[PDB]
Ligand binder design. Structure first.
Ligand code: HEM
Length: 153
């Protein structure tokens, strides 16, 4: 659905994410929890992290962010051909964690915010539009997998 040029813009900025996955992941989660506080309630082990410095120093949160972004990067590198990578994520997020698609919108907003904050010269309007399209495709396809598992979130 994305053009090849759009995928190239997505993967160009993703290579910059991969220079510091941990740091990008922490900034994305800090942004997510600040912008949309309801999302932190899904994480029991992160609730005692009350300040930004605590969140940055938390190995548990840091490792979680790398897990999250690694999964997302592997999906993005498939350029839409991602059923195999996407199914297990849908399974856990639909049936165990119970993450509504709206929360996937919230973290998508945080990803775009952090990428622009860190890489404005590599993340202008066309690259933002390409990343938005890629994350829209991800959210569309994961919502279809949610429903196949019986989850309407
Ligand atoms: C880009 C979107 C996301 C990706 C790629 C992603 C990926 C992952 C991965 C790979 C795991 C570990 C294996 C698993 O349990 O599935 C995970 C765990 C988890 N995710 Fe997500 N996730 C995303 C968004 C979210 C959002 C928005 C929330 C909640 C607001 C969330 C909540 C959780 C929870 C609660 C766990 C279990 C963490 C633990 O106990 O250590 N995820 N996620």
């Amino acid at each position: 659905v994305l053009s090849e040029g759009e995928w190239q813009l997505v993967l160009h900025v993703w290579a910059k994410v991969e220079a510091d996955v941990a740091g990008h992941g922490q900034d994305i989660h800090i942004r997510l929890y600040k912008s949309h506080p309801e999302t932190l309630e899904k994480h029991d082990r992160f609730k005692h992290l009350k300040t930004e410095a605590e969140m940055k120093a938390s190995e548990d949160l840091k490792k979680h962010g790398v897990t999250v972004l690694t999964a997302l990067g592997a999906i993005l590198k498939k350029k839409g051909h991602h059923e195999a990578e996407l199914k297990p994520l849908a399974q856990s997020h639909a049936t165990k964690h119970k993450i509504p698609i709206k929360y996937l919108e919230f973290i998508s907003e945080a990803i775009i915010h952090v990428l622009h904050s860190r890489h404005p010269g590599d993340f202008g309007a066309d690259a933002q539009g390409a990343m938005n399209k890629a994350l829209e495709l991800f959210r569309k396809d994961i919502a279809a997998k949610y429903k196949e598992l019986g989850y309407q979130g």
